[model samples]
Target chain A: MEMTNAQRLILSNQYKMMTMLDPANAERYRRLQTIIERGYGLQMRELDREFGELKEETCRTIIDIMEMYHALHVSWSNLQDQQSIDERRVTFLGFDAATEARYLGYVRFMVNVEGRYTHFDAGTHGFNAQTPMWEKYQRMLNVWHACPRQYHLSANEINQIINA
Target chain B: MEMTNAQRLILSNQYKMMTMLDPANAERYRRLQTIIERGYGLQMRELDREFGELKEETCRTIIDIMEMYHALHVSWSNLQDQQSIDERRVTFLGFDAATEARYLGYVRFMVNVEGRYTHFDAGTHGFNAQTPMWEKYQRMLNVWHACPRQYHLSANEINQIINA
Candidate 1:
């Protein structure tokens, strides 16, 4: 049987949720996440099985489309977490206050990602030795760490992030 | 990266564990179980994604194997619940004891497969139902119904039966 749209939506959202984590954390959660992930695999297989029974290629296309969504989720999730982690690490450990300000200005140009604001709003004024962006980094770490539930935005407290 | 035997064992064990269900009277607890089932669909999609990365033929094979497992799990879980529910219903409704006994006999067959019992163990006499069987089935159901912590039994449960 074909999956309902609501089922598809839930699967899509979960893909997004799984994809938006650091690889390290993602790796840790894979076992827990497997049921969700593998269940979808089984669904796709069901569709294909029915299609194959009907001798049609439509199932193949559908599987392809689902696979694309999965890949997109994994890539985007990895990209976001890696970028955030790198920026946070550098901000807290590397630059002096003067250097931190200069670094943030330069890094923004280099990364050109919007969620840097998530870190900034969380109080991570990157790479400042005196201010030591460490506190902000910890908060960001908390958010990233709290993952599979809440987006890793600096401003959001750990408890509020809803795990998907 | 290759999945080590340890990882495979861990994953398999998890898959096995997800089948256990605990008893619960609360709607919230029941809802959690429903949500976990919903989440399983998304998880299947993740597995599809991994299959794609491996290649189409491999993807199809993986999906097939997983889907078969899921189908068995659904059937087995249903049979387990039906047996328990029917017994309880017959008892609470004050059905005729002889009629209930006959119903339980049909349920016993429904609950057992392969001439031996997976859900319920046969008592000393070939025709007698053992207490262990009911206890075993109840324990299995309790674990199966718990969300988040339960192993996703969709694949393993079915595969075992298929192999048997």
Candidate 2:
């Protein structure tokens, strides 16, 4: 099922609202967010089910598109966060060998995601993987979609202290 | 109506989900977001009302706190958007300088809110704005609170190229 611009806009808006924390209303904020999350989750499953009823390959195809887009979004988000972390670490934490290595590692990860998904071309598919949701999606996408493999950082990679 | 930590967590999660645009499920996605936004608007109003019930000075004090927190959240979200726009502008038709400058202007307006609220702090009754929301709130907090603003580049912004 192709997504319309309006729907995309709505979905994007909804997604961002759910993740935001209103300090003034912190007590109720998370609860409201949770309700939206659960609603959205059910909605996603429903979407999947509806797609399943379509041509047999539709479900898989949709999932494939979503995964590719999701991966790109995640990678992009990590790239941004990683950049911020690097900037702060270097500027505030004082960059050391380990920090440099971590920065390099983040860059490598970003390159891998961007390089692979650039071919998928979300825009061609009518999906803007570079949208604001894509940014937030990258951050919380991990919370929901944990990959099968979690790479380990080597000791040498971990040991450098830049702040001291 | 104080917000609980669980609610805060859920709000953040819901926000993440709302922003996840499948492009395929746009309508459902949008409606869902609208519901969340309306929910938040109601919450904000209620906060305003509650603050209004306090003594004149106290009411202002409460509003000062809320506005300060809210404004910070807005600023934080803008900063994130600016960074995202910066990173992807090279690959995409990014928000132009004038548009960006306008956004910066909006941020300045929010600073005005913060500045006004802080003025009370200078006097004898210098209230310690140590409310949980006060401590946790930042500019990006709204990305989690309200509907994510859509990326609708204006015609003028799109048509005009940066001079430099």
Provide DockQ values for all models, in the order shown: 0.01, 0.03
- Please, what are the lDDT tens digits per residue for candidate 2 over residues B101-122? 3222222222343243332222
Of the true interface contacts, the fraction found in model 2 is 0.04
Off by over 4 Å in 2: A1-8, A15-164, B1-109, B112-164
Error of 2 at B74 (Å): 27
In candidate 1, residue B131 scores what lDDT?
A: 28
Q: Give one digit per residue, the lDDT tens place, for model 2 in A1-164.
A: 23332333334445345344334654344433332332333223334454422344533433433453444334434452443333212211111233233332322333355453333332232232222232332343353344443223222211122111
C-alpha root-mean-square deviation, each candidate: 24.6, 25.1
TM-score of chain A of 2: 0.19
